[PDB]
Design a protein around this nucleic acid. Structure first.
Length: 341
RNA sequence: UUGUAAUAUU
């Protein structure tokens, strides 16, 4: 199958092998496991002139190498360290294949690499081909990364269609394993008038989103990085739901995050809520102190409360210390209290 | 010795 030259190379019959010596075998070498690594390493220390000799052969069947397990690496090397003309010639080779490459395990890596190192006008050409196929890519294990790289590297103006695709889909994709990460890149990069519709749908579903295994991360992203107004809407939804949401595997992390990033006044109001709520027989606090998730929340409130409110809370916990030692998760409240005592 | 993130390529 291979060439004597490639078989001989695989069987270490060439310790002094140079790129010059494999002219005419570049394609075949690029598709070989060792051949590819050989080319990748020699190219790192090749003069611009030597790199061009290689490029001449990789150009014609560029597509064939882009979708190849090993050949994709040789292509990306050229986006990383190539002349402008080489990078344009490769972007010209990608033209009309963006989507099919994006949805492919190796091809997608070439695309991501290209977005990072081609000129803005060329990025804009490349991304146009994703228009109509956003959801397909976002849901895709490989494609979703191409989309994230678009958001990171491309002028936000060129991506209105991403936003437009997400309209009515925010909830669906904030609860999707790959869509949630895409939402998190949008909140980070896309313009205010572009996040605006995204934030609107998030606020409409926050109670539900905090209880999702992925959604909860979206809501916490806003609590950590968003505008004060956004943070406020979120804490307000959480507030009045602290007791139940504190006992929920997923949303319990969101109540902690609200406790950390809420205004001093908001934080105090949330801590006050659990202090004054009475879940039947005993306090909502008591319920939380023996719960598997909420014990964390209570400890969090202890660490972030202003000293005066922390004291009140501690003193309110005191009456139940003897009981708390019997329940599995109680030890953890007591550990925390002991730090402060 | 208490609780959640994407099996993304040589």
């Amino acid at each position: 199958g291979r060439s004597r030259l490639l078989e001989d190379f695989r069987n270490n019959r060439y310790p002094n092998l140079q790129l010059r010596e494999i002219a005419g075998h570049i394609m075949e070498f690029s598709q070989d496991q060792h051949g590819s690594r050989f080319i990748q390493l020699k190219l790192e220390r090749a003069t611009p002139a030597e790199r061009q000799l290689v490029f001449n052969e990789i150009l014609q069947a560029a597509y064939q190498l882009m979708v190849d397990v090993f050949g994709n690496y040789v292509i990306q090397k050229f986006f990383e360290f190539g002349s402008l003309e080489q990078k344009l010639a490769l972007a010209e080779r990608i033209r009309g294949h963006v989507l099919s490459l994006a949805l492919q395990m190796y091809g997608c890596r070439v695309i991501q690499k290209a977005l990072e190192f081609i000129p803005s006008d060329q990025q804009n050409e490349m991304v146009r081909e994703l228009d109509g196929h956003v959801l397909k890519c976002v849901k895709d294990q490989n494609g979703n990364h191409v989309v994230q790289k678009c958001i990171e590297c491309v002028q936000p103006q060129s991506l209105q269609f991403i936003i437009d695709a997400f309209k009515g889909q925010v909830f669906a994709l904030s609860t999707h394993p790959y869509g949630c990460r895409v939402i998190q890149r949008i909140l980070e990069h896309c313009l205010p008038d572009q996040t605006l519709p995204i934030l609107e749908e998030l606020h409409q579903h926050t109670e539900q989103l905090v209880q999702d295994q992925y959604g909860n991360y979206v809501i916490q992203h806003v609590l950590e990085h968003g505008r004060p107004e956004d943070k406020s809407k979120i804490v307000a939804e959480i507030r009045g739901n602290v007791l139940v949401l504190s006992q929920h595997k997923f949303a319990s992390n969101v109540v902690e995050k609200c406790v950390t990033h809420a205004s001093r006044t908001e934080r105090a109001v949330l801590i006050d809520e659990v202090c004054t709520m009475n879940d039947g027989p005993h306090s909502a606090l008591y319920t939380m102190m023996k719960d598997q998730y909420a014990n964390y929340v209570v400890q969090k409130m202890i660490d972030v409360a202003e000293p005066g409110q922390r004291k009140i809370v501690m003193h309110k916990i005191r009456p139940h210390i003897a009981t708390l030692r019997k329940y599995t998760y109680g030890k953890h409240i007591l550990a925390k209290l002991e730090k402060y005592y």
